[PDB]
Nucleic acid binder design. Structure first.
Lengths: 90, 124, 57, 92, 74
RNA sequence: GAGUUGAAAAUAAGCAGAGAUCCGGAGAUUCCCGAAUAGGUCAACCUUUCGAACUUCUGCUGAAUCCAUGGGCAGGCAAGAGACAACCUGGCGAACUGAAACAUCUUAGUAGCCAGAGGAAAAGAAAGCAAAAGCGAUUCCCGUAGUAGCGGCGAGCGAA
RNA sequence: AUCCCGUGUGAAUCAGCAAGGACCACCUUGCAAGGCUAAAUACUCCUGGGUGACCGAUAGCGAAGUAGUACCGUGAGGGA
RNA sequence: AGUAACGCAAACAUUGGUGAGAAUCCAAUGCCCCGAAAACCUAAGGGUUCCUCCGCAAGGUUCGUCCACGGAGGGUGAGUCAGGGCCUAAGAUCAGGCCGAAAGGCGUAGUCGAUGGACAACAGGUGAAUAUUCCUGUACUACCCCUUGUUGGUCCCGAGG
RNA sequence: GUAGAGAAAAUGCCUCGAGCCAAUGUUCGAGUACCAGGCGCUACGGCGCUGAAGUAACCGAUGCCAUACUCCCAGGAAAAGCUCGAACGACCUUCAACAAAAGGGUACCUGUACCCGAAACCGACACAGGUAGGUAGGUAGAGAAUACCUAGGGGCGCGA
């Protein structure tokens, strides 16, 4: 059971999939208040999946060639502009 | 009790390593109830403590409910150390020492040294 | 006249400048003090205050 | 170019609601409701993480640091939107 | 510092012996001195700070040699 | 090679032979203060057009004599700036003490402080030592020698 | 004597110059005022392996549990 | 040695409660004391002591059901009030500059530094703990958006204040 | 106004030029609330509905005009905001600003609890000590003293 799909995703789909992950994770955190307790099974996975996405992107960035400093700057030029979106689940 | 906490190489407790495996059919070697077959059920791998079923008889007591109601006694079966259990198969009903082989395939398994039986058996 | 009591409710901000970490570091001697307070192994190696809220309950 | 008072990632801005009886009274009282935000949040970045995560226009964000370090944000939703019925889809 | 740009002529650590042979410490230092020598290659003066030995030396050996042997100008 | 989600027991769901827990080599992320580095600052903060100052490189090229310059301006790249147990080199360098007092001397060029650097540093290839005979860059241990010698020829220091 | 430094004068270079414990001769050694260089060598906050006529709970690290902790001092610092 | 003491000479008394236990907690009724305060705010400081519910081992110079003590939850909302985002005094740090065994010293433009100058909110409600912060009503300041026009800018600058 | 170029600085003339300065004052804000007092509930708090009058004379400030004014010598901080404009400086109704609807909307961080002439702050103690500033009522009094009291708070934590 492993994610041989992120390495197939290009940049864009990878990115929006990151945002959607963080959203659905926002909702999971939100559910704790009203105690719908399926989270422990499948909370950490969500959290522990965004990391995979980030790792894949950095490797891709690396073959292409950018310094860590440059990558950091690039990340900031992206962190700065992002609009929260409701999660797909409704 | 600090004198007996799990020992920690940099954020983790050393796991030791024991010959016995879950679902094993063991004879108690020496301690106490010497010479009594059993099926292990639960291995505490840091202490080498192993509870085999229906043997060790601990007569505890439990306050059940919040008003002092019930609290009827339970009888739990507590640990026994690992160096006190050998293996048996019902066919060669006899204790033995473990071993190893590399069978014709790649995999590598137990092999009771005093007999020809195989401890690993099927995968499940 | 107050009884020979050395410390009075002086402002934390005023105290910080005199013994503040920022103040402590600038002097050549001050940096030296940090050397020792770390080689011994202290944890609260100053007395400071913070321009937000100098306390966490 | 315009940047946010700081880079907090936006999503990390809100953490959990507050389920105290008093907050229930405020939901049922003012068209407010309480959030618990991490310390590096604003009235811009909280005022612009509810009008873009619940689809409700917000009126005020009275936020306050809390004696132990974390932050706590009363949000007054504009009257046209009504508090309790919104919190019902949230679970409160 | 009191160090000739053109020679490492430092002060001298020397104790001044008295007549009872009582030795104080008396740091002893060069007569390096404010002048303004006429750097020909720019037709123009430069203001320097010169241990007189080094002044004699520039004259005997010219200036620019002294310069590169210490690497000083501009 | 099986069971596991750190300490202690549950707790909640999970993951794993379609290798989980775990152990190694290489990676990636590494919020904020701190050399601290965008600017200020009461350290872990605020204001921020998002990013020091020193070298270096490429361009603009003050002053007087449009000279030549250096300085300044900019776009550059990314190297120095901190840390250290003891050992080492350098600079500054005490005193109580011993001399049955004490100014020469001795503790001692020790301690300490500052400045560098290394896993070792410093020294080093002969304008050396020798002695009518020979050696052959440095650095250490033994031993010559507590001898020669120096010394209010006192306390003591003491080579080759 | 050699050896490096402050002030001022300030040689010759090989049918020369320096040293050979003032200095002078003769002889003998080496030849300055430019630079670099491994080992044997001193060290331990440490890591791995082993050993102990070393301690074993006011001993051994000050410290066999949130030990430079509690506490005390404004502070350096002291410290169970 | 169960000895001195129990921290001022404002002063307690009752009835009825709570409780296993009342001089010591709660509520009355009475007496009394401060009132340029033994009152109400607020700068500093403290830093969780505030509130609610349990608890009584140690603490309280007695007692204890009670506490500023232990345990678990909870709490402090600002365009206007205070500070920062504005300014600068004493002072501090000072690029470059000068001086100095090293560190570093003197020093200019700059940069910080308010105890000071610029600048805009009041009344009444609410409530266990917040209210010039929340609510009601009426205000004020700054920046945009809309209209007509003039096209002429903002800075560095020289002046009033 | 004009004379030595915007702006004051200095010169002179002149202006249906005689009023300017500031707390109070009026009205709206408040045809409103607010309220003593009524009638029920009550696990004796609480709430409920109603709710009249809401005016004048005295004295008086250690607030206010106010850095009015007079008198003194010892002769009393600065820089920003803010108001006027020259090399009408780079830039130009595309990026601009003003009367302006005083029309519509928006409005950044940090502190706020509790003590604060203190049992929790500084004197090591729940210490007959100390701690900036603000408000300042009645009777008698010259008075912020004193004496007795409103508001509010307390009866001092061993007793008989």
């Amino acid at each position: 059971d492993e994610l041989k799909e992120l390495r197939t995703k290009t940049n864009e789909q990878l990115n929006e999939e990151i945002l959607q992950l963080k959203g659905e994770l926002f909702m999971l955190r939100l559910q704790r208040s009203a105690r719908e307790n399926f989270k422990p099974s499948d909370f950490g996975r969500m959290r522990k999946r965004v990391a995979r996405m980030l790792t894949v992107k950095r490797e891709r960035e690396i073959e292409q060639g950018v310094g860590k400093r440059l990558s950091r700057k690039l990340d900031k030029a992206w962190k700065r502009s992002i609009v929260v979106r409701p999660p797909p689940s409704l | 009790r600090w004198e007996r906490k799990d020992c920690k190489p940099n954020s983790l407790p050393k796991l030791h390593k024991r010959h016995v495996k879950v679902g094993d059919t063991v004879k108690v070697i020496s301690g106490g109830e010497k010479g009594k077959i059993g099926e292990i059920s639960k291995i505490h791998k840091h202490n080498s403590t192993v509870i085999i079923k229906d043997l060790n008889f601990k007569t505890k007591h439990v306050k059940s409910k919040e008003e002092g109601e019930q609290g009827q006694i339970i009888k739990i079966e507590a640990a026994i150390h690992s160096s006190n259990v050998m293996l048996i198969l019902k066919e060669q009903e006899v204790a033995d020492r473990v071993g190893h082989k590399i069978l014709e395939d790649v995999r590598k398994v137990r092999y009771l040294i005093k007999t020809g039986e195989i401890v690993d058996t099927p995968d499940r | 006249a107050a009884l020979c009591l050395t410390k009075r409710s002086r402002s934390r901000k005023s105290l910080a400048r005199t013994h503040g970490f920022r103040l402590r570091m600038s002097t050549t001697s001050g940096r030296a003090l940090l050397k020792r307070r770390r080689a011994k192994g202290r944890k609260i190696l100053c007395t400071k205050t913070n321009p937000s809220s100098g306390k966490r309950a | 170019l315009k940047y946010p008072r700081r880079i907090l990632d936006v999503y990390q801005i809100l953490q959990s609601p507050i389920i105290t009886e008093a907050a229930i009274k405020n939901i049922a009282d003012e068209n407010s409701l309480l959030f618990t935000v991490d310390v590096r949040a604003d009235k811009k970045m909280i005022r612009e993480a509810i009008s873009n995560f619940f689809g409700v226009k917000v009126r005020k964000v009275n936020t306050l640091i809390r004696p132990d370090g974390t932050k706590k944000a009363y949000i007054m939703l504009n009257k046209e939107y009504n508090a309790s019925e919104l919190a019902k889809k949230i679970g409160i | 510092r009191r160090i000739c740009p053109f020679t490492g002529k430092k002060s001298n650590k020397a104790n001044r012996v008295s007549h009872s042979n009582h030795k104080t410490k008396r740091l002893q230092f060069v007569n390096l001195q404010y002048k303004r020598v006429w750097w020909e290659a720019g037709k123009r003066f430069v203001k320097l700070r010169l241990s007189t030995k080094a002044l004699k030396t520039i004259e005997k050996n010219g200036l620019d040699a002294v310069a590169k042997k210490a690497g000083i100008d501009l």
